[PDB]
Structure formats: structure tokens, C-alpha cells
Amino acid sequence: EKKYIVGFKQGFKSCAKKEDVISEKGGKLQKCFKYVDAASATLNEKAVEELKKDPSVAYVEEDKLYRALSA
Amino acid sequence: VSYGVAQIKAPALHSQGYTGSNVKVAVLASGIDSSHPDLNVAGGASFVPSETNPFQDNNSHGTHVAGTVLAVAPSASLYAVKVLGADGSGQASWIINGIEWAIANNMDVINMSLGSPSGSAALKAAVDKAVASGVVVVAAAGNSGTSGSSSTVSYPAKYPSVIAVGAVDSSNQRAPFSSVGPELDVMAPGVSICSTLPGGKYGALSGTAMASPHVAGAAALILSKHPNWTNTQVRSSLENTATKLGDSFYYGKGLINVEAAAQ
Ligand SMILES: [Zn+2]
Ligand SMILES: [Zn+2]
Ligand SMILES: [Zn+2]
Ligand SMILES: [Zn+2]
């Protein structure tokens, strides 16, 4: 739908650097990860396209749901 | 106290004086309910934006899972890492925040009794980094039954770095819902497992979610006996000493045997 995780190439370790890339493409940062080279964000479809094409960005993928394996 | 603890041969460890003391187990689930007079939850954090209390479990599964870890490893210290809400679902990013918390707070074991049929590169990165940092990472294999010859193992259990745990009943027969595939590592009890529930209650649940914490608890037992073994060594001991139930697609290496895993 609209929740995504944006993964980054080398050189974007600080949250400020991730946030600036996502912001420049019109996205809204949600959280920067500490170890994983990525951040969650909310993105419209134009922002997704533009981030995918941005040399700083390794991938853009849906922030998909996982569920308890219990009945 | 459930049949499953004897089935995996945890009592042998208890008899030797190993009950999981000073081993930190992160339960990445729907919280762990403070209604229990003895889970000894040592801390935690919530990454479910609208449910900020990790000690409130509005689903029930987190509390049940925690209780199984403790049945297995009675002196272990549990951490409530709430990454799933009341409906039992959570975003990839919330789970990754949970995993990262566990890494930062030097957890010894991560239990993830959760799944999705498709994966997330970022979530693979999170579990991989955790294993890299020395954490034993355990997940329920999935409850998707069979689909021909295809794997039905869920992610994150499907990632190589993660121990994938399928479910057997008390007769060592695979549960009909238990996922299958070459990614299955081991089996543990997962049918009508009695454990702790919200509201100070205690009852049966079924799923690979109930199997996984038997393995997490086994890892805690092994690490209490063998504090110098690495996660790789803990994982290999569990897999290499399992009781073969004949048949890797359906059972992996077979049923864990904590007595055999620990020397
Ligand atoms: Zn015992
Ligand atoms: Zn209790
Ligand atoms: Zn795996
Ligand atoms: Zn030792």
C-alpha cells in the first residue's frame, strides 16, 4: 500500500543521511535502523519510483506484515 | 507444566544443575503479560506504535511462548520485546526494531514465533547481523501444511541464519499444519502445549509458535552449562544430536534432545 523500508548503499550510516535522501524524494521517515543499512518510511508511488532510481538506495520494499504462528 | 519439557529431554539438564541461569532470552511477540506470578520478566520494550506497554499482552501468544521458554529453562531471564499487536500481526520494521534492541541489549537468544510466506531484505539483514553478533536466533517454521513438493517454511524461519522449528505431537508425529521444506532444522512439541496465558490463566495452544520456544529454552539450558560455546556451536549441537524421525523435508534433523546436545 504505502509503508516501506528503504535500504541504503555504503556511506549513509547516520539517520540524518538516510532521512535527507527520503525527504528529498517527498517521503516521510518513520524510523532509522541502527545496524541494518535501512529506514522505514511512508511513500507515495512517485516517491517509491524516485527512491528506487536514486544512487544512494539499495532497495525499496514493502513493510509487510508478519503474524503469530499460533492457534 | 507441559509434556514437551520431558519430550525434549530437558530434565537431564535440570538434574545436573543447569536451568538457564543468567541466560537472557528475548521473546519477540505480542508482549509478556505481567499477570503471571513468576515469569520473571527482566525488562523489555515495545515497537508496536499504538501499544506502548510490552508487559500487556492483548493477544495471549507472547505470554504462552514466554511460559514455554521458562518451563524448559526455569532460571532463564525473559525479555518482553513486543513487535506484534493485539491482532497478532506486526510490520517487518517493528520486528527489525525488536531484533536490533535484542542486539544492543546483549540478549543470548532470540525467539520469533512469527512468520510470513514472503521475505524482506531488511529483515534478512537483521537476523543475519544478530547471528553475526553471536545471538542464537530461533523461529517457528510456519503453519502452512503441505503444497506439493514446494517449501511452505515461513520467513524469517526460511533464512539460513535462523533455526527453523517445526511441530510434533506427543507421539513424535509431525503436526498436520507444520510447514515443510529443506529449510526445516529441527522439531519440538507444538500440539496442545500448556503454558501461561493473560489474566493469570494457563491453557493449551497449538502451532509452530509453541515448538520454537522449546528450542529457545534448550539453547538457554545449553548456554547455562556451556557459557563458552558460540551460537554456531549451540545451533550445531541441537541439530547434530537430534533424534531422527526419518525424513528431512517433513522433520529436518528430527526431534531436539537437550541431554545429547549439552557435553
Ligand atoms: Zn525439571
Ligand atoms: Zn503464572
Ligand atoms: Zn533457517
Ligand atoms: Zn562447556
The amino acid present at B55, given as its one-letter code, is: F
Contact of B186 with B244, CB cutoff 8 Å = no
Judging contacts by C-beta atoms under 8 Å, the chain A residues touching residue B122 are 5, 7, 33, 36, 38, 61
CB contact under 8 A, B91 and A34: no
The amino acid present at B188, given as its one-letter code, is: A
Write the secondary structure of B110-169 as one string of H (helix), E (strand) and C (coil). Answer: EEECEEECCCCHHHHHHHHHHHHCCCEEEEECCCCCCECCECCCCECCCCCCCEEEEEEC
The amino acid present at B9, given as its one-letter code, is: K
DSSP β-bridge partners for residue B243: B255
CA dihedral B219, B127, B99, B78 (to 10 degrees): -10
Judging contacts by C-beta atoms under 8 Å, the chain B residues touching residue A59 are 121
CB contact under 8 A, A67 and B121: no
The amino acid present at B142, given as its one-letter code, is: G
* Residue among A30, A35, A66 minimizing CB distance to B100: A35
DSSP β-bridge partners for residue B45: B81
- CA of A40 from ligand 3 middle (Å) equals 24
Cα–chain center distance at A34: 13
Contact of B164 with B134, CB cutoff 8 Å = no
Which cell is A34 given?
A: 541502527
- CA of B262 from ligand 3 middle (Å) equals 22
Contact of B31 with B54, CB cutoff 8 Å = yes
- Strands A57-62, A3-8: parallel, antiparallel or unpaired by DSSP? antiparallel
Residue A16 near chain B (CB below 8 Å): no
CA dihedral B92, B106, B127, B50 (to 10 degrees): -10
Phi, psi of B13 (to 5 degrees): -60, -45
Method: X-ray
What's chain B's Rg over C-alpha atoms?
16
Nearest CA among B85, B104, B6, B61 for reference residue A70 = B61
Rounded distance between C-alpha atoms, residue B70 and residue B73, angstroms: 5
User: What CATH number does the domain containing A14 carry?
Assistant: 3.30.70.80
Rounded distance between C-alpha atoms, residue B199 and residue B22, angstroms: 27
Residue B118 near chain A (CB below 8 Å): yes
Contact of B209 with B138, CB cutoff 8 Å = no
- CA dist B18 → A11, B3, B226, B228 (Å): 45, 19, 10, 14
Rounded distance between C-alpha atoms, residue B181 and residue B150, angstroms: 7
Cα–chain center distance at A47: 11
User: Domains of chain B (ranges plus CATH)?
Assistant: 1-263 (3.40.50.200)
Please give the biggest Cα pair distance in chain A.
44
Within 10 angstroms of residue A71's Cβ, the number of other Cβ atoms is 11
Within 10 angstroms of residue B263's Cβ, the number of other Cβ atoms is 10
Judging contacts by C-beta atoms under 8 Å, the chain A residues touching residue B126 are 33, 35-36
| DSSP 8-state assignment for residue B133 | T
| DSSP 8-state assignment for residue B156 | T
Shortest Cα distance from B133 to chain A (angstroms)?
11
Three-state secondary-structure class, residue B63: helix
What is the number of domains present in chain A? 1
- Strands B24-29, A38-42: parallel, antiparallel or unpaired by DSSP? unpaired
Rounded distance between C-alpha atoms, residue B155 and residue B207, angstroms: 15
The domain of A63 spans: 1-71
Q: What angle do CA B250, B87, B40 make, to 5 degrees?
A: 80
Rounded distance between C-alpha atoms, residue B45 and residue B52, angstroms: 8
| DSSP 8-state assignment for residue B90 | E
Rounded distance between C-alpha atoms, residue A13 and residue A17, angstroms: 7
